[PDB]
Amino acid sequence: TTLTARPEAITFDPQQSALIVVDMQNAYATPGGYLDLAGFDVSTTRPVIANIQTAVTAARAAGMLIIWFQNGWDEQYVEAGGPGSPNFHKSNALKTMRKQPQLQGKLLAKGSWDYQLVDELVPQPGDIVLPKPRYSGFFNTPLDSILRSRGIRHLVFTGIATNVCVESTLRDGFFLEYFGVVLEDATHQAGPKFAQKAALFNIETFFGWVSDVETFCDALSP
Amino acid sequence: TTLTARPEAITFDPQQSALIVVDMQNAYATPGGYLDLAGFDVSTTRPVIANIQTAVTAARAAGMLIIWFQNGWDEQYVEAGGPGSPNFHKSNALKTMRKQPQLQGKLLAKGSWDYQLVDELVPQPGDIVLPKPRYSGFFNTPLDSILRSRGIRHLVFTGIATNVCVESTLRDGFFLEYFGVVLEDATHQAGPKFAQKAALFNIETFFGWVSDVETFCDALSP
């Protein structure tokens, strides 16, 4: 399958490629979630949810593995790492809960609403759901093993945030010799608009390839 | 020792810390080198070499291990991975050499001038110089093993490029539970100016701490 993309078109076989839906949880996409309560602009994630639903439909019809990432930890946050982990000190979820103890135990907490995938995005049997503890899905998980067990070498990245979990999971895949393509209109950034543009810049320029849902679906139909 | 930084000051013991000089080779800092030849601006790097000198002489006075990274491959680029590696297809150096074949073997090649550390930066006995085959210092090398063996938990990042080898190595540092510091004025981005800004927003907001060389030195004075 030949997929038009920046910096150039690339070839991938759907049946040895995976569509990764990164962290489409209430935390990252819904008003009133973690990222919202932490001050980020999530007021525009309605089209990203639809696009992901459109790309999840196409890839599944094409025989690509669907993988869902859910980022977060136990409601005690043992898994977030104690004061001895840089994660303890940089997670903005932990920052919000330490600032807002009412929220303590809820942001990114497994089993909770914040942690739930948004209502519109429902995994299907045979999909892989991966709980990851850190932004990159390639650290601390069976992700690499899941993908290699199936000879997957191409990854089609969606989700939130384009500069944080998406691009860490893409860069780290590049270093594990995965070819990564990012569907720009199926991602959203954490931070100002330039964070979106620079993640697609850094991905396009050094790590991988940028395409869109429309080009992605169209190329799958054969 | 506290280091004033954004988004807040951090405490670290410089004897439990290392300063990493990421890829301050002619390829990434000297005009006529790969980044210049590739079309990235390298006009503004003279002050980065001086700030890195200042930081290095400061770190070593405080007992911090100094780690120099040299990026690149063998002269026939077998180590760059062949067509099965995304690195073969994304590497602008190889792209730049495929465009200009008079440059075959010149860029990022061991033995080449392009691969040498710039003349102004001279590793001293004591330092560790590490080659790395990919953007990130942590994949494919003993970097992690070296820092564990000395009980280091704090990395202080200098070099080029902020958005890529520097940011990827700090990012993977985070995921390996190191606290990452970048001295913003001892770094230079690859790409437009907004690739410096955005890399710093990302380090600062999600992955670690941002400081600058002069603050760093004042923190090491006692």
From Swiss-Prot, chains A, B:
Keywords: Hydrolase. Induction: Up-regulated by the nitrogen regulatory protein C (NtrC also called GlnG) and repressed by RutR. The active site is at residues 23, 132, 165. One of its GO terms (molecular function) is hydrolase activity, acting on carbon-nitrogen (but not peptide) bonds, in linear amides. GO terms for biological process: nitrogen utilization; uracil catabolic process. Gene3D superfamilies: Isochorismatase-like (3.40.50.850). It is an enzyme of class 3 (hydrolase). InterPro entries: Isochorismatase-like_dom, Isochorismatase-like_hydrls, Isochorismatase-like_sf, RutB. It holds the Pfam family Isochorismatase. It comes from the Bacteria. It catalyses: (Z)-3-ureidoacrylate + H2O + H(+) = (Z)-3-aminoacrylate + NH4(+) + CO2; (Z)-3-ureidoacrylate + H2O = (Z)-3-aminoacrylate + carbamate + H(+); (Z)-2-methylureidoacrylate + H2O + H(+) = (Z)-2-methylaminoacrylate + NH4(+) + CO2. Its EC number is 3.5.1.110. Belongs to the isochorismatase family. RutB subfamily. PANTHER family: ISOCHORISMATASE-LIKE DOMAIN-CONTAINING PROTEIN, PEROXYUREIDOACRYLATE/UREIDOACRYLATE AMIDOHYDROLASE-RELATED. Hydrolyzes ureidoacrylate to form aminoacrylate and carbamate. The carbamate hydrolyzes spontaneously, thereby releasing one of the nitrogen atoms of the pyrimidine ring as ammonia and one of its carbon atoms as CO2. This is Ureidoacrylate amidohydrolase RutB.
